Amino acid sequence: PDSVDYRKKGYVTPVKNQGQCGSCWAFSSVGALEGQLKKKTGKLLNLSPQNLVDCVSENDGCGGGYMTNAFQYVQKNRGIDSEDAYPYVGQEESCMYNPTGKAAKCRGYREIPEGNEKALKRAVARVGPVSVAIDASLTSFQFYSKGVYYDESCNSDNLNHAVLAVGYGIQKGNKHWIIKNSWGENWGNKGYILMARNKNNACGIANLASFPKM
Numbered sequence: 001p002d003s004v005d006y007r008k009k010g011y012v013t014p015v016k017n018q019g020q021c022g023s024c025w026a027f028s029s030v031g032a033l034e035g036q037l038k039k040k041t042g043k044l045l046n047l048s049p050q051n052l053v054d055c056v057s058e059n060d061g062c063g064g065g066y067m068t069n070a071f072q073y074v075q076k077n078r079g080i081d082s083e084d085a086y087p088y089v090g091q092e093e094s095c096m097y098n099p100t101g102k103a104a105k106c107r108g109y110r111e112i113p114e115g116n117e118k119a120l121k122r123a124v125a126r127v128g129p130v131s132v133a134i135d136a137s138l139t140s141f142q143f144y145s146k147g148v149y150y151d152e153s154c155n156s157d158n159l160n161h162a163v164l165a166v167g168y169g170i171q172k173g174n175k176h177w178i179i180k181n182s183w184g185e186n187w188g189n190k191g192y193i194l195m196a197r198n199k200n201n202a203c204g205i206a207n208l209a210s211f212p213k214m
């Protein structure tokens with residue numbers, strides 16, 4: 001069955017709203033972690049993006065960052081706090097990681113071969129929700145609400161926004177990826193957007209994908 005929806009499997013936490021802070025990579029990172037945590041312990045809980053924003057020295061907090069740097073941070077740190085133990089405030093602050101708030105661990109990360117949607121698909125099915133980067137600068141993207149998103153003008157080399165691939169499927173002859181955003185439930189469709197799958201790596205959905213080894 002060429003389709004899977006981790007939201008129905010209970011691997012995806014409610015949709016979050018990151019505000020203006022450039023923490024998309026943090027929500028994307030916790031997103032993937034929340035999925036592997038659910039898979040391993042059968043427990044579904046919100047992880048702390050604020051933990052990453054203030055602690056991942058390789059990234060730039062509200063200035064932007066890479067998900068792989070984030071996963072690496074949790075691995076070396078041997079842990080990441082839950083959302084409730086280290087609440088999101090929308091601004092970079094000093095690193096306040098607390099071991100008693102440790103909700104999950106991480107053992108490293110794997111990166112899907114660049115631009116290989118076929119591989120990306122395999123990873124989503126085999127491992128679970130995958131962290132991915134895309135060009136989210138278009139107005140068509142930001143005004144998405146229904147259907148399968150596909151805009152030619154999307155620049156697969158202009159990766160600038162981080163999101164989460166929680167699955168994939170097909171709608172009326174248009175294959176797609178089920179993508180979790182971090183702009184609240186009022187954006188897109190209950191917070192999600194279906195992005196063109198197999199339509200020439202649209203928006204570069206497969207140029208920078210990865211998940212945490214748990």
Ligand SMILES: *[C@](=O)([C]([C][C][C][C])[N]C(=O)O[C]([C]C1=NN=C(C2=[C][C]=C(C(F)(F)F)[C]=[C]2)O1)C([C])([C])[C])C(=O)[N]N1[C][C]OC1=O
Binds near residue numbers: 018021023064065066
């Ligand atoms: C995002 O889309 C974030 C914030 C963008 C603010 C520049 N985008 C993002 O992280 O993109 C990264 C690639 C990236 N872009 N900038 C950087 C970066 C900048 C500076 C440094 C440092 F100073 F450390 F050298 C390092 C890295 O990395 C990626 C494509 C890989 C996800 C977002 O949060 N969007 N926003 C902002 C406000 O509301 C939003 O939705």
